[PDB]
Amino acid sequence: KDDGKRVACCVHGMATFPQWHRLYVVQLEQKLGKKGLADIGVPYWDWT
């Protein structure tokens, strides 16, 4: 926390929520890719 209250780092309820989460998923994408796999990214599970 900015006051040193030891708060989480998850962004929820702020406008930057989708942007932060897409940055998270692309982080994991690149982490997986750098291990040697370069064919397909993480799939999306449709529920609509």
Next chain:
Amino acid sequence: HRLLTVQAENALRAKGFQDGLPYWDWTLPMTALPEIVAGETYVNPETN
């Protein structure tokens, strides 16, 4: 032997590759075996 080479290419294509298998050229004279295969351990600076 042509079928063997084709199957090897198709098998290796799905493991992160772009072009076909390089061919050695032993017809042209050389003084040493290829350095691509000579070594036992090579240093990759990708992992340093």
